Every structure is written in structure tokens, then in C-alpha cells.
Amino acid sequence: GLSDGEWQQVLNVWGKVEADIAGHGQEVLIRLFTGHPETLEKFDKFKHLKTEAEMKASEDLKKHGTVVLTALGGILKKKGHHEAELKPLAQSHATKHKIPIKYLEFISDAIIHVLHSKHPGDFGADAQGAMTKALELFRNDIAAKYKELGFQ
Ligand code: HEM
Structure with a gap:
């Protein structure tokens, strides 16, 4: 649950x-x-990447990064009223991709890390607080759907 100022x-x-x-x-x-x-092993189309240089050179990895962040951005813009947008992603990640909730924690912290790395000094403590709460809400609502499905 976020306030209006936190969503802003x-x-x-x-x-x-x-x-x-x-x-x-x-x-x-x-x-x-x-x-x-271990997260790479969940991606049949990226498991061939052995070095970070190959990862950096991969245009398909950048393409998938666009897909991921486009989906997350659509969810964030709903300011918590995201049941319809979140349900299919929870279902595909639990039942088809078999992604444990732990890996959603990993990617949440990775987003915070990347924001500081690309915008050093421009990602303030209030902004980190609000972004963290938004990713916690996203993860928590996924977790509820995982529990419904019995997925660990
Ligand atoms: C911010 C969190 C995430 C978002 C918004 C997200 C979003 C998406 C979307 C939109 C797709 C394509 C449609 C679909 O299959 O539902 C997808 C596919 C996939 N996701 Fe995620 N995902 C997230 C986190 C993760 C994590 C942490 C993993 C694994 C460590 C993962 C594994 C996969 C895999 C394996 C696919 C299929 C890739 C392919 O072969 O095309 N996702 N994800």
C-alpha cells in the first residue's frame, strides 16, 4: 500500500x-x-551465454529486457490496481516458466542496483523507498497467486 506521494x-x-x-x-x-x-538456467534462449561480453552483445537479451520492463511499467502505472495485468504474469511464471518467488526478489533488488548505477546521485532516498515499496507490492501480489496455485 502506497500513498499518492509515493506513487508520484x-x-x-x-x-x-x-x-x-x-x-x-x-x-x-x-x-x-x-x-x-542459476537464474540463467530458466531461460532456454539465454543459457548459451557464458560471458558477460556475450550477454552485452546479445540483441535478443536487450529485446527481452524491453518486454520485461514494458510489462512492469504497465503494472506500475496502475498504482496498485493491477489485478488484471498481474494475473497472467503470475500464472505464466508459476506454471510455465517455474520461477520461484526468490528470483522475483533477486530481480527487484537488481532494479534498485541498476537505477543507482545509471543515475548516481539522482536516485534519492525517498525515491528508493517508494520504488522498493512498489516492487514489494508487486512481489506480494504475485506471492498470493503462487500460494493459490501451490507453487514453490
Ligand atoms: C519484474 C519481473 C518480471 C516481469 C515483469 C516479467 C515479465 C515477463 C514477460 C512479459 C514475459 C513474456 C510473456 C510471458 O511468458 O508471460 C516473460 C517471460 C519469461 N520470464 Fe519473466 N518477468 C519477470 C521476472 C522473471 C524472472 C525473475 C525470471 C527468471 C529468473 C523470469 C523468467 C521468464 C522466462 C524464462 C520467460 C520466457 C522467456 C522466453 O523463452 O521467451 N521472469 N517475463
């Missing part, structure tokens, strides 16, 4: 992402894959 911070930060969605999406996935190499 989230959507202000998101403007930074929308200026370069592919570059942000690429770096988020690279941070996930290099920090948590």
Missing part, C-alpha cells in the same frame, strides 16, 4: 527508465544473470 515518486523514477527502456532492461537482466547464475 515511483512514476517520476520510471520516467528515467522510459527514456532508455532497452538499456535499462539489458542491464537489469545482466545484473540478475551475473549475480545469480
